[PDB]
Amino acid sequence: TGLDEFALLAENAEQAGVNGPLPEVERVQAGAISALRWGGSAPRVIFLHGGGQNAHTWDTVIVGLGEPALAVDLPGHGHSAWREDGNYSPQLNSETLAPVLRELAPGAEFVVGMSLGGLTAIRLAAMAPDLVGELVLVDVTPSALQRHAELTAEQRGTVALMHGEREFPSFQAMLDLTIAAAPHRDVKSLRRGVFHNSRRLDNGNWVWRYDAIRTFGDFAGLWDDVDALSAPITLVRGGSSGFVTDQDTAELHRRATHFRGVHIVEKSGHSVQSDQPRALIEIVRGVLDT
Ligand SMILES: [Cl-]
């Protein structure tokens, strides 16, 4: 389409149940990392999306919260550079991101990360304390993503041997795939997500903005980082998500120096920011104490 990436923000304000003028937002870049900068040049919160997502996953939450924020595109996602070695490990993501965040979000105490983003946040908190005052993990722990990585490994192996990146005859065909994976979800919300996560080729076909993740990375080291972090950790689970177990949550409590507790969001799957953004806004607002 010809549609600008900020053309649907009224839909995000309605989903967040807020009215009034939309906040200012623009895309920023420092080398390999692209981000959306909301509310001007002094972000209070950094948001890190999950595997297969981009920064726009946070639009509803950011519009509802009304705070200045930086929503970053992880390597291999959104407008951030791909890597030919297909490796978007939390550790590698953190190494690329830290100097960019020092430049674009030096005064943001709070980091909210979902899934791969949440483990990226843990590694940032460890390697760059001065930055990260407080972590909010959305539906992930090191153990939980390790279990997901182990289930998906055979198929991440098989896809790795297709060297095709896929192409799609239409936008609708990508939307059909996303409907198939979440058919109970409002299709205007799904359509908005696919719009941001996809682009049209000159040859009329469509492709995903994200790189197949051939590989994730390191978790023993990631638990050592949890043992060392001083940033308090809040966990947010999806009540309909099996991704994080009660034992996962207890393990996180035992290793963290300051676990603030788990919030369990009724009628949310794994992507709490997509399924129940209003409930996530209230929890993030509470952490801000604001
Ligand atoms: Cl992920």
From Swiss-Prot:
Belongs to the AB hydrolase superfamily. Changing R156A: No change in sensitivity to Zn(2+). Optimum temperature is 39 degrees Celsius for the hydrolysis of p-nitrophenyl hexanoate. It holds the Pfam family Abhydrolase_6. GO terms for molecular function: carboxylesterase activity; hydrolase activity. Disulfide bonds: none annotated. Changing Q155A: No change in sensitivity to Zn(2+). Changing E154A: No change in sensitivity to Zn(2+). The record marks G51, H148 as: Involved in substrate selectivity. It catalyses: a carboxylic ester + H2O = an alcohol + a carboxylate + H(+); a butanoate ester + H2O = an aliphatic alcohol + butanoate + H(+); an acetyl ester + H2O = an aliphatic alcohol + acetate + H(+); a hexanoate ester + H2O = an aliphatic alcohol + hexanoate + H(+). It comes from Mycobacterium tuberculosis (strain ATCC 25618 / H37Rv). Changing H184A: No change in sensitivity to Zn(2+). PANTHER family: HYDROLASE ALPHA/BETA FOLD FAMILY, PEROXISOMAL MEMBRANE PROTEIN LPX1. The lineage of its organism: Bacteria, Bacillati, Actinomycetota, Actinomycetes, Mycobacteriales. Changing T158A: No change in sensitivity to Zn(2+). This is Esterase Rv0045c.
